[PDB]
Design an enzyme around this catalytic site. Sequence first.
Site, PDB file in Angstrom:
ATOM      1  N   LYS A  53      72.005  74.774  45.102  1.00  0.00           N
ATOM      2  CA  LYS A  53      71.744  73.344  44.834  1.00  0.00           C
ATOM      3  C   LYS A  53      72.848  72.872  43.916  1.00  0.00           C
ATOM      4  O   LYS A  53      73.092  73.346  42.789  1.00  0.00           O
ATOM      5  CB  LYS A  53      70.400  73.163  44.125  1.00  0.00           C
ATOM      6  CG  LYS A  53      70.176  71.714  43.604  1.00  0.00           C
ATOM      7  CD  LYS A  53      70.016  70.686  44.747  1.00  0.00           C
ATOM      8  CE  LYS A  53      69.525  69.314  44.281  1.00  0.00           C
ATOM      9  NZ  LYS A  53      68.198  69.428  43.666  1.00  0.00           N
ATOM     10  N   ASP A  69      72.705  66.660  37.315  1.00  0.00           N
ATOM     11  CA  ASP A  69      72.324  67.038  35.956  1.00  0.00           C
ATOM     12  C   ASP A  69      73.119  68.255  35.430  1.00  0.00           C
ATOM     13  O   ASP A  69      73.186  68.460  34.230  1.00  0.00           O
ATOM     14  CB  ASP A  69      70.826  67.320  35.858  1.00  0.00           C
ATOM     15  CG  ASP A  69      69.946  66.073  35.999  1.00  0.00           C
ATOM     16  OD1 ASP A  69      70.428  64.962  36.304  1.00  0.00           O
ATOM     17  OD2 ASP A  69      68.715  66.240  35.787  1.00  0.00           O
ATOM     18  N   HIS A 120      60.635  72.277  43.475  1.00  0.00           N
ATOM     19  CA  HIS A 120      60.905  72.723  42.118  1.00  0.00           C
ATOM     20  C   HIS A 120      59.793  73.665  41.729  1.00  0.00           C
ATOM     21  O   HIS A 120      58.617  73.286  41.770  1.00  0.00           O
ATOM     22  CB  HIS A 120      60.952  71.557  41.140  1.00  0.00           C
ATOM     23  CG  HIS A 120      62.090  70.588  41.399  1.00  0.00           C
ATOM     24  ND1 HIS A 120      63.141  70.459  40.545  1.00  0.00           N
ATOM     25  CD2 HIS A 120      62.307  69.697  42.430  1.00  0.00           C
ATOM     26  CE1 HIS A 120      64.008  69.529  41.032  1.00  0.00           C
ATOM     27  NE2 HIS A 120      63.503  69.057  42.188  1.00  0.00           N
ATOM     28  N   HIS A 177      73.568  69.615  41.715  1.00  0.00           N
ATOM     29  CA  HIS A 177      72.766  68.562  41.079  1.00  0.00           C
ATOM     30  C   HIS A 177      73.574  67.852  40.030  1.00  0.00           C
ATOM     31  O   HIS A 177      74.219  68.475  39.187  1.00  0.00           O
ATOM     32  CB  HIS A 177      71.523  69.160  40.450  1.00  0.00           C
ATOM     33  CG  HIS A 177      70.454  68.149  40.159  1.00  0.00           C
ATOM     34  ND1 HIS A 177      70.604  67.175  39.235  1.00  0.00           N
ATOM     35  CD2 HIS A 177      69.211  67.965  40.729  1.00  0.00           C
ATOM     36  CE1 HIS A 177      69.497  66.409  39.221  1.00  0.00           C
ATOM     37  NE2 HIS A 177      68.651  66.880  40.144  1.00  0.00           N
ATOM     38  N   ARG A 208      69.343  51.779  41.027  1.00  0.00           N
ATOM     39  CA  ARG A 208      68.828  53.009  41.643  1.00  0.00           C
ATOM     40  C   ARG A 208      67.574  52.828  42.491  1.00  0.00           C
ATOM     41  O   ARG A 208      67.433  53.495  43.520  1.00  0.00           O
ATOM     42  CB  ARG A 208      68.597  54.075  40.572  1.00  0.00           C
ATOM     43  CG  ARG A 208      68.040  55.372  41.167  1.00  0.00           C
ATOM     44  CD  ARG A 208      68.287  56.588  40.309  1.00  0.00           C
ATOM     45  NE  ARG A 208      67.356  57.635  40.687  1.00  0.00           N
ATOM     46  CZ  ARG A 208      67.241  58.822  40.111  1.00  0.00           C
ATOM     47  NH1 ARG A 208      68.056  59.216  39.133  1.00  0.00           N
ATOM     48  NH2 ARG A 208      66.271  59.614  40.524  1.00  0.00           N
ATOM     49  N   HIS A 235      62.589  71.208  49.481  1.00  0.00           N
ATOM     50  CA  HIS A 235      62.886  70.611  48.187  1.00  0.00           C
ATOM     51  C   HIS A 235      61.766  70.860  47.214  1.00  0.00           C
ATOM     52  O   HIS A 235      61.012  69.935  46.838  1.00  0.00           O
ATOM     53  CB  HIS A 235      63.177  69.113  48.358  1.00  0.00           C
ATOM     54  CG  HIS A 235      63.839  68.488  47.161  1.00  0.00           C
ATOM     55  ND1 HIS A 235      64.740  67.485  47.269  1.00  0.00           N
ATOM     56  CD2 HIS A 235      63.721  68.766  45.788  1.00  0.00           C
ATOM     57  CE1 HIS A 235      65.167  67.152  46.040  1.00  0.00           C
ATOM     58  NE2 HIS A 235      64.537  67.917  45.136  1.00  0.00           N
ATOM     59  N   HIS A 265      63.507  59.464  32.191  1.00  0.00           N
ATOM     60  CA  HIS A 265      64.835  59.468  31.569  1.00  0.00           C
ATOM     61  C   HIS A 265      64.796  58.921  30.162  1.00  0.00           C
ATOM     62  O   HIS A 265      65.842  58.709  29.543  1.00  0.00           O
ATOM     63  CB  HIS A 265      65.806  58.673  32.444  1.00  0.00           C
ATOM     64  CG  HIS A 265      66.208  59.394  33.704  1.00  0.00           C
ATOM     65  ND1 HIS A 265      67.457  59.870  33.901  1.00  0.00           N
ATOM     66  CD2 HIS A 265      65.472  59.734  34.841  1.00  0.00           C
ATOM     67  CE1 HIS A 265      67.521  60.477  35.104  1.00  0.00           C
ATOM     68  NE2 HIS A 265      66.303  60.403  35.675  1.00  0.00           N
ATOM     69  N   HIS A 306      72.270  66.753  45.297  1.00  0.00           N
ATOM     70  CA  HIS A 306      71.834  65.541  44.590  1.00  0.00           C
ATOM     71  C   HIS A 306      73.079  65.075  43.887  1.00  0.00           C
ATOM     72  O   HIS A 306      73.548  65.689  42.908  1.00  0.00           O
ATOM     73  CB  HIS A 306      70.685  65.909  43.647  1.00  0.00           C
ATOM     74  CG  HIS A 306      70.263  64.822  42.671  1.00  0.00           C
ATOM     75  ND1 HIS A 306      68.942  64.635  42.305  1.00  0.00           N
ATOM     76  CD2 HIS A 306      71.016  63.905  41.924  1.00  0.00           C
ATOM     77  CE1 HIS A 306      68.894  63.637  41.385  1.00  0.00           C
ATOM     78  NE2 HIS A 306      70.153  63.188  41.164  1.00  0.00           N
ATOM     79  N   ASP A 336      60.070  67.247  46.901  1.00  0.00           N
ATOM     80  CA  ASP A 336      60.553  67.104  45.517  1.00  0.00           C
ATOM     81  C   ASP A 336      59.420  67.422  44.543  1.00  0.00           C
ATOM     82  O   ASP A 336      59.359  66.839  43.460  1.00  0.00           O
ATOM     83  CB  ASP A 336      61.171  65.716  45.259  1.00  0.00           C
ATOM     84  CG  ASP A 336      62.315  65.728  44.284  1.00  0.00           C
ATOM     85  OD1 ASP A 336      62.528  66.746  43.581  1.00  0.00           O
ATOM     86  OD2 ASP A 336      63.083  64.709  44.260  1.00  0.00           O
ATOM     87  N   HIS A 376      66.969  63.704  49.266  1.00  0.00           N
ATOM     88  CA  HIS A 376      66.561  62.312  48.978  1.00  0.00           C
ATOM     89  C   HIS A 376      67.653  61.314  49.278  1.00  0.00           C
ATOM     90  O   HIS A 376      68.131  60.591  48.404  1.00  0.00           O
ATOM     91  CB  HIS A 376      66.009  62.121  47.559  1.00  0.00           C
ATOM     92  CG  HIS A 376      66.772  62.846  46.480  1.00  0.00           C
ATOM     93  ND1 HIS A 376      68.050  62.581  46.174  1.00  0.00           N
ATOM     94  CD2 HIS A 376      66.371  63.867  45.632  1.00  0.00           C
ATOM     95  CE1 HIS A 376      68.462  63.387  45.185  1.00  0.00           C
ATOM     96  NE2 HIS A 376      67.436  64.178  44.835  1.00  0.00           N
TER      97      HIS A 376
HETATM   98 NI    NI Z   1      67.202  65.341  43.123  1.00  0.00          NI
HETATM   99 NI    NI Z   2      64.537  67.533  43.091  1.00  0.00          NI
HETATM  100  O   LIG Z   3      65.310  65.733  43.598  1.00  0.00           O
END
Ligand code: NI
Ligand code: NI
Ligand SMILES: [O-]
Lengths: 122, 570, 570, 100, 100, 100
Positions: B220, B224, B139, B222, B339, B137, B323, B249, B363, B275
Amino acid sequence: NYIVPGEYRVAEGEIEINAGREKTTIRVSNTGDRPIQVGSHIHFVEVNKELLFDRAEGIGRRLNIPSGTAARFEPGEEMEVELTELGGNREVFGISDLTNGSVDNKELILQRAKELGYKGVE
Amino acid sequence: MKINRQQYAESYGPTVGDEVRLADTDLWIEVEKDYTTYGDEVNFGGGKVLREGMGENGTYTRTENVLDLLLTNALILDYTGIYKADIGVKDGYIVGIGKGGNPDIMDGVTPNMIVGTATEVIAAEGKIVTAGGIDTHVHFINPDQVDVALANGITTLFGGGTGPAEGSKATTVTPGPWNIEKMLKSTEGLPINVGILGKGHGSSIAPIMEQIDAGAAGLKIHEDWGATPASIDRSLTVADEADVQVAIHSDTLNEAGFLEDTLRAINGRVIHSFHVEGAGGGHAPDIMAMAGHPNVLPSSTNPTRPFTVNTIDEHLDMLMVCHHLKQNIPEDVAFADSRIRPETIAAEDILHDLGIISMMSTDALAMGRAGEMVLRTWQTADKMKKQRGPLAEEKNGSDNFRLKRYVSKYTINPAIAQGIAHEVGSIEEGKFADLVLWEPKFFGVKADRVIKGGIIAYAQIGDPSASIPTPQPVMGRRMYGTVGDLIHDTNITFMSKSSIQQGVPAKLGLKRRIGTVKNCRNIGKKDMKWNDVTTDIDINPETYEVKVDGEVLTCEPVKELPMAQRYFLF
Amino acid sequence: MKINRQQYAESYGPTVGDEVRLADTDLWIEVEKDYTTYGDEVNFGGGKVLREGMGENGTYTRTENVLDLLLTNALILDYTGIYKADIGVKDGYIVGIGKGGNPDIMDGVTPNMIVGTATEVIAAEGKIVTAGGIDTHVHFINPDQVDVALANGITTLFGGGTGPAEGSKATTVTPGPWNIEKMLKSTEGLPINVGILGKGHGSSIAPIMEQIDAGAAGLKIHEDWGATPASIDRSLTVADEADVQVAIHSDTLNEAGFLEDTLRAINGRVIHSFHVEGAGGGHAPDIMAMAGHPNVLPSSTNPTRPFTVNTIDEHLDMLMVCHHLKQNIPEDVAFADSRIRPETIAAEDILHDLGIISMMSTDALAMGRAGEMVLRTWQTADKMKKQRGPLAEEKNGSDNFRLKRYVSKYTINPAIAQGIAHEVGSIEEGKFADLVLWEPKFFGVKADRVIKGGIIAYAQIGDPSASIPTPQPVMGRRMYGTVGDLIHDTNITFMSKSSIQQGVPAKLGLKRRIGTVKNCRNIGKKDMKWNDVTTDIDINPETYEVKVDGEVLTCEPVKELPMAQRYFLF
Amino acid sequence: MHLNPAEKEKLQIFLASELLLRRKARGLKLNYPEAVAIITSFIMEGARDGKTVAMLMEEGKHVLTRDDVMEGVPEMIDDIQAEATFPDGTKLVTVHNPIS
Amino acid sequence: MHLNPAEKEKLQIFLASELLLRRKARGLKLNYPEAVAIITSFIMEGARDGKTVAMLMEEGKHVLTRDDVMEGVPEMIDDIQAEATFPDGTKLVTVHNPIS
Amino acid sequence: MHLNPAEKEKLQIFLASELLLRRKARGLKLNYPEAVAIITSFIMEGARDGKTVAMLMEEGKHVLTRDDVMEGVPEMIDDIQAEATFPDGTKLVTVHNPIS
Ligand code: NI
Ligand code: NI
Ligand SMILES: [O-]
Ligand code: NI
Ligand code: NI
Ligand SMILES: [O-]
């Protein structure tokens, strides 16, 4: 419960090295004027010419001391050491070029040792 | 002649029945077996055993059972065992685990572990040696993250990103054929193994599949980008054809469905749930129920690991900051409270201890720490020992069962999930020589030396101007494996079968070793080493209480951890 | 019109008969001759001589006797002389030493030293220019060691190692074909010339020889691998066939023989004796007697250079630390006392001064300092001047004889020993343009600019954001010669004839310049420039007293050195 | 010492804070990077002291006031973030609107 | 200044020592890298002062005591090594078991 | 902070000056890089204080005198140059023959 990071907690008992192999004690003299230190895994018959001992008793053997340690002979020093048997294939190549094959070839090893002046060929 | 055990351990490292403390934790590992022949231990130095005609053979050429590298007297910690052995490496791979030296004169020498003219030596006596960590994981946001990972013993980075673009700062995604090609070329300069994930989003197959053909090693999904039933479905259809893994995710907002809808879209196909506890993202509040299912390979990310007194305050604010949430907007506060949940974070500790969550991951730079996967695994194990006791499976005195369960979470299990365990993830014959040496006092905290493909890539070492390498300042530094063209031979770019068949490496001028991703679709929870438990996880929608086998899973947060302020300058 | 000599020297650097102090030592070098024509000196800048139609020729194309680079007004310090000249460089090589400019209008212009459109200029007025240092005792342990070497004017590293593996931390050895291939590829990223030594150990020829064929440039015999009669013999048999040099660190322990046994095994063949004084290793106590023999090329390593009041305490403890020796084990104390000897260290100073030890070297990161070979050479010369007086050979006033004797120890002599003096090691026409500029105030301490293959590779330069390059902080920095693919054209990888014939560079994708090692087996002590003395060196086995020609060689340790606390921040 | 990459980097924050504190002590109104350095080092030292994340979120808003800094600096700094090793491991502190 | 690579690196040891000394001054028991930094900087400053290698081998054992550092830190530090420029050039100092 | 490359580098000058000032305070005659560090940091801090280039050209000649430094150091330093951000932007200061 004081914590020493990474500390060992060893088991009980002791570790026997070279278990089950014949041991031999011999007297060895440094006849030279400079110190000689001998490691655990050198074929004992092939050590420095100026060490005087019964060379035949070094054939196929090495010091019976912990792996990576050594025996020290100061100039003129005579002392007893304990030898153990070589294992594996019981062959030695290189070092002093006295063997280059099986350690069973005692007559050839001693012939070479004598011709080259390794002290104590009897 | 006999040697007492204290003196033996000081000279050669520990032997059978001896125990060693992991850093400043309460965890003790015990040597289970030892491949040596007592008296014929290998060692290197002035007057030592590995010398010509002695422990080093002077006859054989390199091809003739001789090693390129011998690690002497290693205490191996691996899913396969906790044991003492020499490790032999040749052509960049582990070729022998056993007893090295010279069959001329030593008993018990493993036949392909001859020390010869061609052999380099690393002294591992008094060190713990593990496989390199596999972080699935990642980025790719800031290249400075690579040394951070290496310094805590990570040797493979799987994930996505193009640098500090918002898509990448949010999601492990390198989107589309061109960004993928660009990042495969960037990877040529990164001194670590890499695999790249494409965007697992679309309602037609071709836009998703062309990423796999371009050189992606997985996908992935996600939220988003829209973690919709359609994107889930198409991504898994692609993955089943392509033999790559899909990470998810999920839809935290429950916008297009609740957890059961995501599971329906998955339709029994294999998936890696990132996660899984959900502070890091997913169906609120019950995402962690994923970890009960046979087709789910579940991982945690590291900031919830383990549950501590600062965890909640830290996460609630981290979420609001990231966020751009406002404390005076009630929907934002409600989102955050739904959350970030102490009930599920506390249960996550226990689910790790029970073998229900199978993997750890970082992450890195999105909501996780690039250099703390290994660190936090051991802090979790230590907390669980303190709060739950030795596991029932332990054979009196030692923590070996727990240690194998936990080492598996960041070594072999992520490798299996990603389809790369034929190459990496454990200390086994036939696998790539990615190895990490640790002083026990620094275990899990700061790696001593990180070996990549059989050459040291990273080391804690001192003043380069000094007479010897140990004077201050001792710091993490890149070593020769990372320099010049050696960076190509010591690292692997993992890619899809199709991209390899289509000649993408040649097209892009990739010089790194190319690894094939395979056997990702025919696995499940049962294949997670020491962490193979399936069960019905119930998460109460009102209270967020987690139940397994009718019992509430709860524990307290801790005020202090080991592997923390004793070690770090900041 | 006449100019006084002070003003002349300030404008153009010194001329014939002028003297210059080396750093803060008591050593004075004197300009022996000058190639200029007074009034037609070359110089560059606003309103200066090297302008089109004037000192720069505007007619000739690059091929037509025009230079790529002219160093104007250099004070050369070299085994060949201490003299004033312009230096002309083309295609990365020194092509002219003489007088540069434009034959249109200037008298005395060397015919192939035309300044034309194609010519870059470096102003060397007021600088001392030497060849780059040749360090033949490098352990490749930490890549950060390269800048350390460059900063003290070293441009070639010969040695071995794979990084901070124990074999490499102990021995200058890159063992076997695979480690050698890996390190040749690493070398592609190191901004310095490199040659790699294989393991000089074995009892069969093939395991040793295959290293030479793989790309090694020489061999190292080291006691830590067994410096036995057999390993000595086989290595020299290989070297005689392969035309490469063998270095030796002999059997300190006298385990398989005393010095005379090692000499018998050598059997009159050429060999480079490393750290010949023996604190750095070798037959205790009498190894330094090697330096008397005609077939021995003897070098020192740098921590004993020169004998100072902290030397013994430092070495005794350094040895105990590194060998994990205990102060309460009598054999360990006896070993240390037999190896670290003020009698032989003091004699080593004198043997350098007499031309009996021919070379200096570092022992970088094993028992020596990567950036202090040049530094300590000059500190030794200065000590000897203070304690022994000007050498008898000096022509009144100057230290030129001593300066040529000592500069040879780290430039031409190591190059000759290694078989690379056709390419490097001196400022002579036809040799590679590895040149070091020094301000006299920093001579031997911190290089101003290091030129590699005709492009600056390293420089002491300031703030990169400033209007000009001289504002603080002035520090050592890599320059454009080290960037991109220019690193390939400005550095040489030295390799065996056989590896070159067998196409190893193409096989490995090596892009650096490839240098051939040759003419290593047909040389001896007589070929060491200014340091060619053979004599019977007696070392008393009881007292360790060193005698040459019936006289005890002894001197006192000094409490202070030049080139020390005036210059260094730490 | 066994310094990792973050430990090396974060030394620079401490140094910049020391520089800025000397500037403040001789009467200067502080600028943007000076202000950020002082507050950041304060957070990291507070973690070292064993304070909680919640304590530091509070205290970080009282380290510098508007009269300590140049015109516009308060409005330039929306938040300051730092990670440090607390007794319970690394945690993130965000100080919101640190200078009113 | 003409800083070489070692001079640049070793500035960081001085800085880490300054940081650690401030932590000690406000009452904290010091950790492993803090303890190593303080003793290392002490050695390098002692060389600068013109002390001998032998003096520093002695003094280095009395810079910090066990009550100055966290539990286990004395046993974590087997030795501390530093090179610095003495009046007679660069020398290596090793302080064995610096904290009893 | 938004540090640029020069801001990172120049922190090291401040640090070297702090080191050198501590050495001077305990009675040592300063060496070449120590002397250069002290004068350079003085210039950069003076710019920060809002002095003019002309003021600093004057003051820079009175920071250290020959009795503060080792033999030969005054003659080794022909000038010291530094750029810093003045109220009117970056400017270059050169202090000629700073130590008489
Ligand atoms: Ni995530
Ligand atoms: Ni992530
Ligand atoms: O993540
Ligand atoms: Ni040596
Ligand atoms: Ni060496
Ligand atoms: O050496």
